[PDB]
Amino acid sequence: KLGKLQYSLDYDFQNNQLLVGIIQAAELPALDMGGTSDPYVKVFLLPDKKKKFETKVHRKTLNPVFNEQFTFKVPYSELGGKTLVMAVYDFDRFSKHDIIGEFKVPMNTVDFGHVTEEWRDLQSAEKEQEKLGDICFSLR
Amino acid sequence: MALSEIETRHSEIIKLENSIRELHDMFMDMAMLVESQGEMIDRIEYNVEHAVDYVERAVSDTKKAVK
Ligand SMILES: [Mg+2]
């Protein structure tokens, strides 16, 4: 309900690197005072959360246009089992930056060869039990 | 990039190779024609020198004939 996100995806086989472009976003819900939020998008490889990339902060727009580009130096063999995460955050100067949305893209569903660029609907990020342990015994 | 970029790259490259090949063949034909024409010039110069000899002897004879 927050809005949609237009992004670009393609792989450069000449340098063996992933080219992820953040085009823009639309119809984002407002969380700030003026009637518009201050959005910025954090993008990182889904498999390992290392070297996350963040875009510049846009002031008071529910339709931010970033038109930015990020490069993930990852071989083509490892790429297949690697996912992409694009999460939209709301900037706040005096508090925690609340997450507006998130989107995950499996690299086995992605087809490289033609330059991909699409709009995808944003969804609410996941917050389960912490322990995840089990004990087995018998009663008689 | 993608497979489209690589494919177009490959295509334009092949195009370049064919243009290059046509250039090559043109140069070959050039050398050929120039050579054959060279032989033609050989026989021309031959005939001309013979003509010069004949003319010279003729002129000598007439020059001795008039006086
Ligand atoms: Mg704010």
Curated annotation (Swiss-Prot), chain A:
Residues noted as binding Ca(2+) 2 in the record, renumbered to the chain: 31-32, 90, 92, 98
All copies of domain C2, residue ranges: 1-120
Phosphotyrosine: modified positions: 89
Binding positions for Ca(2+) 3 per the UniProt entry: 92, 95-96, 98
Superkingdom as given in the UniProt entry: Eukaryota
Localization per Swiss-Prot or TrEMBL: Cytoplasmic vesicle, Secretory vesicle membrane; Cytoplasmic vesicle, Secretory vesicle, Synaptic vesicle membrane; Cytoplasmic vesicle, Secretory vesicle, Chromaffin granule membrane; Cytoplasm
Tissue: Expressed in the brain (at protein level). Predominantly expressed in rostral, phylogenetically younger brain regions, and in some endocrine tissues.
Post-translational modification Phosphoserine, affected residues: 124
Post-translational note: Glycosylated.
Function statement: Calcium sensor that participates in triggering neurotransmitter release at the synapse. May have a regulatory role in the membrane interactions during trafficking of synaptic vesicles at the active zone of the synapse. It binds acidic phospholipids with a specificity that requires the presence of both an acidic head group and a diacyl backbone. A Ca(2+)-dependent interaction between synaptotagmin and putative receptors for activated protein kinase C has also been reported. It can bind to at least three additional proteins in a Ca(2+)-independent manner; these are neurexins, syntaxin and AP2.
Subunit architecture: Homotetramer. Heterodimer; heterodimerizes with SYT2 in presence of calcium. Interacts with SCAMP5. Interacts with STON2. Forms a complex with SV2B, syntaxin 1 and SNAP25. Interacts with SV2A, SV2B and SV2C. Interacts with RIMS1. Interacts with PRRT2. Interacts with DNAJC5 in a phosphorylation-dependent manner. Interacts (via N-terminus) with RAB3A. Interacts with SYT12. Interacts with calmodulin. Interacts with DNM1 (via C-terminal proline-rich domain (PRD)); this interaction facilitates vesicle fission during clathrin-mediated endocytosis (CME). (Microbial infection) Interacts with C.botulinum neurotoxin type B (BoNT/B, botB). Has lower affinity for BoNT/B than Syt2; mutating its residues to match those in Syt2 increases its affinity.
Domain notes: The first C2 domain mediates Ca(2+)-dependent phospholipid binding. The second C2 domain mediates interaction with SV2A and probably with STN2.
Similarity annotation: Belongs to the synaptotagmin family.
Name of the protein described by the UniProt record: Synaptotagmin-1
Included range, full protein: 141 to 281 of 421
UniProtKB/Swiss-Prot annotation, chain B:
Sites of the Glycyl lysine isopeptide (Lys-Gly) (interchain with G-Cter in SUMO) crosslink: 63-64, 67
Gene Ontology cellular component annotations, sorted alphabetically: acrosomal vesicle; actomyosin; axon; endomembrane system; glutamatergic synapse; membrane; neuron projection; nuclear membrane
Site feature (Microbial infection) Cleavage, where: 64-65
Tissue distribution of the protein: Expressed predominantly in cerebral cortex, hippocampus, cerebellum, adrenal medulla and retina with weak expression detected in non-neuronal tissues.
Gene Ontology MF term list: ATP-dependent protein binding; calcium channel inhibitor activity; calcium-dependent protein binding; chloride channel inhibitor activity; identical protein binding; kinase binding; myosin binding; myosin head/neck binding
Domain called t-SNARE coiled-coil homology: residue spans: 3-65
Subcellular location(s) of the protein: Cytoplasmic vesicle, Secretory vesicle, Synaptic vesicle membrane; Cell membrane; Synapse, Synaptosome
Any one of the GO BP annotations: intracellular protein transport
Post-translational modification: Phosphorylated by CK2.
Keywords assigned: Cell membrane, Coiled coil, Cytoplasmic vesicle, Exocytosis, Isopeptide bond, Membrane, Neurotransmitter transport, Phosphoprotein, Synapse, Synaptosome, Transmembrane, Transmembrane helix, Transport, Ubl conjugation
SS bond partners: none
Subunit structure, as described in the record: Part of the SNARE core complex containing SNAP25, VAMP2 and STX1A; this complex constitutes the basic catalytic machinery of the complex neurotransmitter release apparatus. The SNARE complex interacts with CPLX1. Interacts with STXBP1. The interaction with STXBP1 promotes assembly of the SNARE complex. Interacts (via C-terminus) with KCNB1 (via C-terminus); the interaction increases in a calcium-dependent manner and induces a pore-independent enhancement of exocytosis in neuroendocrine cells, chromaffin cells, pancreatic beta cells and from the soma of dorsal root ganglia (DRG) neurons.
Family per record: Belongs to the syntaxin family.
Name assigned to this protein: Syntaxin-1A
Gene source species: Rattus norvegicus
Lineage, broadest ranks: Eukaryota, Metazoa, Chordata, Craniata, Vertebrata
